[PDB]
Amino acid sequence: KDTGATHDLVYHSKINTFVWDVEFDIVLSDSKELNKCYFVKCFNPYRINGKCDFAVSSIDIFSEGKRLLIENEFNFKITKAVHVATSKDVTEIVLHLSERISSPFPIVKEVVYLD
Amino acid sequence: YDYHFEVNGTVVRHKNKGFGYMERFFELKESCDERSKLSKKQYERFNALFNFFEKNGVICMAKDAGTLNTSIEINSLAYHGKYDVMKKFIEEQSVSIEDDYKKAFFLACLGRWEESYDLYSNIILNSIDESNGCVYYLSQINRYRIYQSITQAVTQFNGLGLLTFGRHYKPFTDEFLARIEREMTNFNIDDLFNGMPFEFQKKYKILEFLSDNQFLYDDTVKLFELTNKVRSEMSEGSYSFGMSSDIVVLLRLYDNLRFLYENCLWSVSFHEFHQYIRNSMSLLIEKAEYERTRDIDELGFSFFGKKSGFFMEYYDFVNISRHFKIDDIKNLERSCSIDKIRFGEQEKIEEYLVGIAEEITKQFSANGMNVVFYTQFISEAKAALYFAKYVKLSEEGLGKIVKALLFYFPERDLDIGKRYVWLERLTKCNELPKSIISIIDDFLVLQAEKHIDQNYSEVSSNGLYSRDYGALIKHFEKNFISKRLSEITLCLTQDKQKQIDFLFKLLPLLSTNAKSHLLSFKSVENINDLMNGIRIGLIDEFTPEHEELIIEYLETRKVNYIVEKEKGIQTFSSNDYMSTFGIWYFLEEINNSKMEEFIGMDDQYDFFVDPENFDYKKFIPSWLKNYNDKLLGKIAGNKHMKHHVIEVLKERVKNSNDKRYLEILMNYFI
Amino acid sequence: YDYHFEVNGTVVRHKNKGFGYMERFFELKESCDERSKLSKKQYERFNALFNFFEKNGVICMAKDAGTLNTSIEINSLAYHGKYDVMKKFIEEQSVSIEDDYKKAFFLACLGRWEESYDLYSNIILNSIDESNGCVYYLSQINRYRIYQSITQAVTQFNGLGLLTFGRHYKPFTDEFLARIEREMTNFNIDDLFNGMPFEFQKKYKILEFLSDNQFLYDDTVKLFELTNKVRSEMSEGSYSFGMSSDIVVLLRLYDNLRFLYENCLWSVSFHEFHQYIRNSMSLLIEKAEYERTRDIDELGFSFFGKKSGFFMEYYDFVNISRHFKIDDIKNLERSCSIDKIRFGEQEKIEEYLVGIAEEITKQFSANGMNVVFYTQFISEAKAALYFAKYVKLSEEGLGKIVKALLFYFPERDLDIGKRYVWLERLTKCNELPKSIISIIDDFLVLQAEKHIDQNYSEVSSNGLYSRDYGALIKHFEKNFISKRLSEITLCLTQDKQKQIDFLFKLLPLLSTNAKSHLLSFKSVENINDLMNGIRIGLIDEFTPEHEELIIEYLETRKVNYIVEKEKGIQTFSSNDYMSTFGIWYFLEEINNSKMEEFIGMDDQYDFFVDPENFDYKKFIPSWLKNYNDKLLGKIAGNKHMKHHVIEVLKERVKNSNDKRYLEILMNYFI
């Protein structure tokens, strides 16, 4: 690739997920557009479940520093992702680093282990 | 340098070109009648030496050494954290100038650094004419070390502001800050030893190191002979105790603590002394883990009847609580097995934990606190209630810890998610009896009663919320009714909309008349209401009226399937709900038979509902990194998918070396 | 403390508020127009500063820092092991006092400690007129360290004596040892920096650290922190895609080697400095294994596709050889896979290994009596020829590496068992040339010429003997007969008993005419000859004449096993015959059903003879890495064995750090 920032970009191999401090401007299927989104994923394999829970990871969606209350089916199309520490506009890169991961949310901001 | 006084209490000749007097002195101590031949004045000088060497633990010679136990006792109220007895001591009338020396250290340990600066400045005035400079020289060291504490606090108070300390100011007046800067201008601690009287420098040359910038430089380099020269010691084999490099490093830790706490030196609160305790306790646990695993290769797995070689006690508990951060305890928990470290003296570890619970109660069930005491104490109260996983607690002692952890521990340090992580750790060696459930059931009520405000949301950095406390109650007492939560949900209307959404997560805790009226706001009509109804809503059931909407969304996706291929759109960026449905089928919670007639849409769906008719060259091996202990056990249940995914795990543990694919393959698939 | 000077050539300003005088200094470096405003008495004070930092490595500030290209060159003959250049440098004529400081370090490195103490002694007479004192203070340190080096020898030459080198030998005369304890027994190394002028203090304040361990203290603290965060990024599965997180450990390493070898300090021969180097490079290889077996599963890295890897240069081969023991390399070879780390500059690892093979024949062929030099050199020559498995060698360089290994390594260190081990290692990367079989043949005819005594027998500690040199020849030269040993086994009388046992071990290496000459002399009359007879292709199947000799051995064992119960001890042979028997019975090589009556003597015998009724509390997991391909795949077939050597082998995957237990588990059992 080109001369990107790529300095806090780490790859967690335990839950197949990139971690670097970016912000999202996502748009759903037909619901609305949101500003300054970021994800936080938490790896909790020892968890008191229901009779329907199946995942080791759980995702909190954050919208402005406050938690998004999910009310719809969550389609994400990253209209514009932007880097925060270096202010570059990392938009097309996070598109093509996402199909070759084949996980639900490939880029997050932090990953918490065993909660 | 005439003798070695080794850490066992024994004496070895080193360079005594002269008369052997320490060899002779213990010949007087052994005999009872030969010492009744000495002088008059020079016989009470024997009782004073016999008390000194017994109090400091110099026992006998090393050529005539016995088999005697040398246990550690630190007699200090500031080591044990007896904060309320330290405060009763500060409010008593000082007889001596040695009692003001001990008060000035207890003031520093209690965080009130202004009173301690002034009380050391008082002692220096009253102790120049003293004929020994120990109260004078050490008050000049401790006054300068507590000046380094004030200057580094007023930096970090203005680095955080109000978001961390919670007081929105700094606890030092400028009449105190600009005073002590004038009093400490060009105060060189180096010229302190070389500017004291000549009789001080001969008599007390051993106190010279406290004026240095960094001591403990020799003890850190002696940690190299601890953990990683036993690479070569196991070629011939290392053993148990025997004053091995294990015991020498541990007893020199216990001498450096007992020196610095019984002589009330404030250099015991610095980063260089905290890193020394970290670097030397972490490296004694890595050594005992190494010697355990090598003794399972050469000897057998049952030849070591003990759990592990490193046996902790009360003083090892307090040194990890006071000196380690939580990112440093987590390094021990991966680089050892503290389930294999047996903790002794658990009636003393309990009396230390109840006592941290008493101080967290007193600091924050009150309008009175320091921000200087709170910054150093809350790192120890966090590390001690975190490390209490490994301790059996009594029922009346655990109940005082759970009340201080759930109600009185400040949210600036432990949010709602980190309290659950540390409450769940207390239920491993213990469990939840019927008395500790009633504290959580008073926590959910106090969190229910706070969510009636329209501008309140829980802030949690782990992803764990009030949902998860309720899952912990039901994991132990499967039949439980919260009579105060089941009296706030049927005294409930649509006037408060947020508390409707709070108590959606707490449905298996409520009663039948409660679940009657709280299900009066659950409108499941679209499949958008299905998934949060099953994930978040806790429906805990599958009616055919539930599954009928699933078939409809399946069939419309099958209606979308004929335009899935004719339009060329194949991207599902979490547009699925579909890998989720086959997992519900495979777990035997969807009792349809007509599901398998829809198995052509998603590859992950095609695996869970049609195992036998599946093309395993379409398997994405990363799917097993999203499946939990529940679902991975069921894939080792199915006789059709067991032998296939072993070959996809073996091609990922041979080609890469991923320690998660190996952890799956061993704990479930063999 | 006005500017942090990091180990990457950057400068970070901390603890300064006045004029920034290093910022203005690098503005002078980049531009030429800011020069010529310099006074001529100040401009000549610039080319010395500009040459000071281009020699040392302070390139720029932190802000204007671009590339971090930094190579390394330790220009010192002692780092490179040029021994025959040092001998020609001491025989050369003295020129200055700086050329004698660089001289006395070279005699110390050559084990001439009697003459190097005398040479440092002359510098102390002369260096006061030098008006600098740095040659004086560093010679006072270095002479005191040579003194402390000749005290640990005389408490180990006169202490151990017999097992080290022959008998009680004296490298130092009784006059010298008595006299140096007189000239320097009032010396205190703690007051060497204080007993010097105040012009030498505050202009050489960075040299008070050389009196003690506190020149290693800032690097030991940074090892112990950067270890803990590499281990915790490895127990997390995290892969940073930028600069390496232990590039600090590499650059801070090579500063300590370029400080101490260039400035000619004898602190390079410490234990505490040797222990810093191996803990630094164990971390660099444990992370290098972690990073070459990574998996992104994204068709390679897009932006990080041009990432370079850790590879062994020349300076890394020398730092493992001087500073590791063999047990330090044994751990690093079972935790990591050095055979997949690629090694560079193979052309100048030649001259280090040819140079070691030439300095070991220049003192174990002629009168090489310097057992002082033998004390630390032979631990380097052992660790270098052991770690030479991984380098590719030329045939003229391999030949003198092998001829020095077999003939001129002393048997006090490297007996005949671990002399075979370090020969089979050198054949892995180097397929064995024809001029090296001629070196083994000159070694097998020599051991035969030593067996003409009836009192000479081979002593090993591995169980490997002079047979195994002959299977190694018959591994690469399947049709090869000797012409010189066959000229010895043609002359065989009855009075040559130890000769004829020896050549019956080496029977497939002897000629077709002479194999008939010895086998018609003596034949199988023992079970010690049966073990010999199987492996040399003489007994293709067990006849009943041999099995009765086996049970006669097992009975006389059992009668000895009865009387063993009263003495209550357990003593085995060098080669354990009992475990070989059970492997033959388990592989259906012996058809006898009478050996179940012997179960209860040795634990490995009971596993193979009775796989059904064995107590698996006493199964040693080290047994599994002694077995070949066939025996291990037959333990995987026995249903009485398979599901119990999984739980032995699962717990050694997750608890040990050996990589063999995976390869046994995956290739055979899963």
Author numbering:
A (entry chain C): 6 to 120
B (entry chain A), C (entry chain B): 336 to 1005
Give verbatim excerpts from the published study on this entry.
As a sirtuin (SIR2) family protein, defense-associated sirtuin2 (DSR2) has been demonstrated to participate in bacterial anti-phage resistance via depleting nicotinamide adenine dinucleotide (NAD+) of infected cells, which can be activated by tail tube protein (TTP) and inhibited by DSR anti-defense 1 (DSAD1) of diverse phages. To defend phage invasion, Bacillus subtilis utilizes DSR2 proteins to sense and recognize phage SPR tail tube protein (TTP), then unleashes NADase activity of its SIR2 domain to deplete the cell of NAD+ and abort phage propagation during infection. Each DSR2 protomer contains three domains, an N-terminal SIR2 domain (SIR2, residues 1 to 297), a middle connector domain (MID, residues 297 to 627), and a C-terminal sensor domain (CTD, residues 627 to 1005). Structural analyses and biochemical studies reveal that DSR2 forms a tetramer with a SIR2 central core and two distinct conformations.
To elucidate underlying mechanisms, the cryo-EM structure of the DSR2-DSAD1 complex has been determined at 2.98 Å, with DSAD1 bound to DSR2A in the open state. In the structure, DSAD1 consists of strands β1 to β5 and one α helix between β4 and β5. Extensive interactions between DSAD1 and DSR2open consist of residues S18, I53, C57, D58, F59, E76, F79, and F81 of DSAD1 and residues K960, R802, W919, K965, N963, N863, S909, and S908 of DSR2open. In addition, the binding of DSAD1 introduces new contact with DSR2closed by DSAD1 residues K6, Y16, and S18 forming hydrogen bonds with DSR2closed residues S637 and I631 of CTD and residues G572 and Y574 of the MID. Compared to TTP binding of DSR2, the DSAD1 binding induces much slighter conformational change with an RMSD of 1.138 Å between the overall structures of the DSR2-DSAD1 complex and apo DSR2. Although the SIR2 domains within the DSR2-DSAD1 complex exhibit conformational twisting to a certain extent, the magnitude of twist is much smaller compared to the changes induced by TTP binding. This conformational change on the SIR2 domain tetramer is not harsh enough to hurt proper tetramerization conformation critical for its NADase activity. When superimposing TTP and DSAD1 simultaneously in one protomer, DSAD1 binds to DSR2open with the lifting α42 generating a wider binding pocket; the falling of α42 in the closed state clearly blocks the entry of DSAD1 like a door bolt. With the direct steric hindrance in the binding site occupied by DSAD1, it is impossible for TTP to bind to the same DSR2 protomer. The binding of DSAD1 locks DSR2open in the resting state, by not only competitively occupying the binding pocket but also stabilizing the MID of the adjacent protomer to stop the transduction of TTP-induced conformational changes in DSR2closed, allosterically inhibiting the activation on DSR2 NADase activity triggered by TTP binding.
